[PDB]
Structure 1
Amino acid sequence: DIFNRDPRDHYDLLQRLGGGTYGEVFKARDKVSGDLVALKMVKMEPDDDVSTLQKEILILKTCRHANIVAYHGSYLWLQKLWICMEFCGAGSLQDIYQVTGSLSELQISYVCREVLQGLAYLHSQKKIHRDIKGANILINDAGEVRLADFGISAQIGATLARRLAFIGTPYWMAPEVAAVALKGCYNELCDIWSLGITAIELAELQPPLFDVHPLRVLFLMTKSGYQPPRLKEKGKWSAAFHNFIKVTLTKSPKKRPSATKMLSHQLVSQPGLNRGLILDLLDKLKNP
């Protein structure tokens, strides 16, 4: 679904949401339906070709699940690629917790369940996300949870190249990912570790060791006695939440549970985990 035309033929842009090295993200409205969408603009380089683009764009269409932002279409126009996707109006979990403060245990439990459903899908497709963190998990206005994309392997062209060249920030990375040159390699269970880190992030407003220099953190993950992190406050959280963190942050990947196994954990299988918990969080955001 690549159109060689101006995306403004089909969409009215409404707001510029964010930017980066990747490019620009916009809230837009479908001119027929009136439905909101997100439009992501990336600049095309002279090196880039439409044959490699079509294949990359095809995978965006097919790697489909309720807990991953849905792809609608793409536009190639004036050396800019626009990707059209499902709108998640509350932004990322980072956007939310930086305003609301720490999520409740039930809110975190719901988010973790929803992310794990996405991961179980991706892992079943033999895909490693590699980028699970609060900033890459979006919330729509109905309180539903969506991964921004299927992770590092969803990135296109020069953005993908940069992602391979620079491992980036290590705070959510499994130690086996950090140490891939030095020890033996990694697999999809790195995402489970990342989810454990994310649960702490939502609880405490930052991942463990966030005040330590990232090169120092990366270095410490190489050494034999790297200790998995823990929640700082004992009394605030249930035994189930502490145990969820313990098991997701299992140091040995051989012993770390799969996404589907984690979905049977007490924390994420308890009743009353629904989007209403996040509707309450968004009502708190709106009406502090």
Structure 2
Amino acid sequence: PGMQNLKADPEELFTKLEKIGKGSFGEVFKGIDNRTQKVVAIKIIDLEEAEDEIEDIQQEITVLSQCDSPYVTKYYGSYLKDTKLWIIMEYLGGGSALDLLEPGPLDETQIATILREILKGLDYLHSEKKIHRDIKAANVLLSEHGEVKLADFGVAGQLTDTQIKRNTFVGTPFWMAPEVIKQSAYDSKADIWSLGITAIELARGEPPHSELHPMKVLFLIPKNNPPTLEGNYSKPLKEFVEACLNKEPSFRPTAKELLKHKFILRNAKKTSYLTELIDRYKRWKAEQ
């Protein structure tokens, strides 16, 4: 249906190793591409224990298959095996940006570096008329040497000539733009709001309203003034957040524009410097 390139018998080409993740969809496993010995991530979904989101799982494969960017998790293919569908993607062993927050706070160079790479991902997606719709630190994954990529396209949307806006209530409430919660007509500017919340998340460790029940934020977000970054942070970082978190979507800058923001230019450095953060998490995790 949109599965034209669905492949068969994955275990000839890949080796399944241990489990590494879980979600509403099913489960995620480490694996090996037996042709290259590169390590991959295999998302496995039980088609029979699946229902309704079958319509989503296809959409996810569709979006993934259409992305070709170093800032988006590489897509290897979807494979059918008895009752299970394998969705095989690039493996990234550095941890998510949310993981890297667990041991302690980031500094603004690290925040800027991570945001700059997220922005390159968003610029790529939005130039392809795609909207991620679940931007948050947990879906920003790093290689063990500091490359930063967007992941989890489970609720990603696509715009077309006949569908210039979306309306669907998707995303993670703390990070959702007010127009998405209202289910008004929205586009890639929704991702820019979520990016602003993600910036606060990277700076403070958690998004606004994080101690509240997510249902409460469904009225708080459309109603309240937009969040701001409070605390002892640089003015350009605070202005970066402010630019993103405008209630009116057309007043938010594009990802391209944000790549030239003073905060990004003054503070972002080489991604390889992020190995320091990756090492911190490994040490921290080993002693938990």
TM-score by length of 1: 0.84
**Is 1:89 aligned to residue 93 of structure 2?**
yes
Equivalents in 2 of 1:131, 1:55: separation in Å? 14
Query: Which residue of structure 1 aligns with residue 164 of structure 2?
Result: none
Query: Which residue of structure 2 aligns with residue 67 of structure 1?
Result: 71
Tell me, which stretches of 5 or more residues in structure 1 are unaligned?
Answer: 156-163
SS at match of 2:229: coil
Q: 2:249 aligns with which of 248, 253, 268?
A: 253
What is the Cα deviation at residue 276 of structure 1?
2.0
Query: Which residue of structure 2 aligns with residue 3 of structure 1?
Result: 7
What is the Cα deviation at residue 21 of structure 1?
1.8
Identity of matched residues, %: 44
Query: Which residue of structure 2 aligns with residue 161 of structure 1?
Result: none
Alignment coverage as a number of residue pairs: 270
Equivalents in 2 of 1:165, 1:185: separation in Å? 9
Displacement over 3 Å in runs of 4+: 45-48, 52-59, 164-169
Q: Check the 8 A contact 1:75/1:82 in 2, yes or no.
A: yes
Q: 2:84 aligns with which of 80, 86, 106?
A: 80
Query: Which residue of structure 1 aligns with residue 217 of structure 2?
Result: 217
Matches within 5 A, 1:1-288: 1-5=5-9, 7-45=10-48, 57=61, 59-98=63-102, 100-150=103-153, 152-153=155-156, 167=170, 169-180=172-183, 184-223=184-223, 226-233=224-231, 235=232, 237-270=233-266, 273-287=269-283
Equivalents in 2 of 1:209, 1:34: separation in Å? 44
How has the CA–CA distance of structure 1 residues 43 and 165 changed in structure 2, closer, same or farther, with 3 Å as cutoff?
farther
C-alpha deviations, 1:20-69, integer Å up to 9, x for none?
Answer: 22011011112232211111111113879x9x988864542222211000
How has the CA–CA distance of structure 1 residues 227 and 83 changed in structure 2, closer, same or farther, with 3 Å as cutoff?
same
What is the Cα deviation at residue 154 of structure 1?
6.8
Q: Check the 8 A contact 2:19/2:30 in 1, yes or no.
A: yes
Q: Which moved more, 1:7-16 or 1:67-76?
A: 7-16
CA RMSD of aligned residues (A): 2.7
Q: Check the 8 A contact 2:112/2:267 in 1, yes or no.
A: no
C-alpha deviations, 1:95-134, integer Å up to 9, x for none?
Answer: 2212x22222111111111111111111112222111001
TM-score by length of 2: 0.84
Q: Check the 8 A contact 2:108/2:267 in 1, yes or no.
A: no
Equivalents in 1 of 2:171, 2:132: separation in Å? 15
Q: Check the 8 A contact 2:132/2:191 in 1, yes or no.
A: yes
How has the CA–CA distance of structure 1 residues 59 and 256 changed in structure 2, closer, same or farther, with 3 Å as cutoff?
closer
What is the Cα deviation at residue 165 of structure 1?
8.0
Tell me, which stretches of 5 or more residues in structure 2 are unaligned?
Answer: 159-166
Q: Check the 8 A contact 2:139/2:150 in 1, yes or no.
A: yes
